Write a protein that binds this ligand. Structure first.
Ligand SMILES: [Ca+2]
Ligand SMILES: [Ca+2]
Ligand SMILES: [Cl-]
Lengths: 114, 114
């Protein structure tokens, strides 16, 4: 099966600062001969299920703030929160949707540094 | 780990007819003190990642039409589409978010029998 690994498992930065989360896939997620990757990023708030943020590595779902951006292609991806806000504190997961069903990485808890 | 089983794997009903999907969890997902089930339902269109439809077994996400409804508790749940429309043709997954990360059932392909 495909292995999805995120780094770090938890991180904290000051309000307004940039936060970066890494995700590695054991399998190259490029789709066929296209430039698109079957890699998505989700946000999970306490007691809630994960909700879609980004698909195809960098495309934002309608309604998602511009401070959320994804990069990478192949096996290594990155989710960046350019300026961390209070409402962004949550667990972020990368997800490969090449397989049926898709599978998530371990998730990365993002917090505000006191 | 937790085993999420859906039944059937594929189904088709006439336009406007009711579609029913079953999901079984090897893990009791009900927190009796809060009366909440860490069970959600997602919809996946071709080439896209799964998007949230229902959380806490029966609560619909904002924007989801009322023809979609979830029921069940503990280990057995059901997603029901009262009147199947063409835009509903997709793969549906139940998801347990008891563990970290959450995991999906095998998925159920829903089509219109014209
Ligand atoms: Ca019929
Ligand atoms: Ca109770
Ligand atoms: Cl979603």
């Amino acid at each position: 099966d495909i292995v999805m690994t995120q780094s770090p498992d938890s991180l904290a930065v000051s309000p307004g600062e940039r936060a970066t989360i890494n995700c590695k896939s054991s399998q190259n997620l490029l789709d066929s001969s296209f430039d698109t990757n079957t890699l998505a990023w989700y946000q999970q708030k306490p007691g809630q299920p994960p909700k879609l943020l980004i698909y195809w590595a960098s495309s934002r779902e309608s309604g998602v703030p511009d401070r959320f951006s994804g990069s990478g292609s192949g096996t290594d991806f990155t989710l960046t929160i350019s300026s961390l806000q209070a409402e962004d504190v949550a667990v972020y997961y990368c997800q490969q949707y090449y397989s049926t069903p898709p599978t998530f990485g371990g998730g990365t808890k993002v917090e505000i540094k006191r």
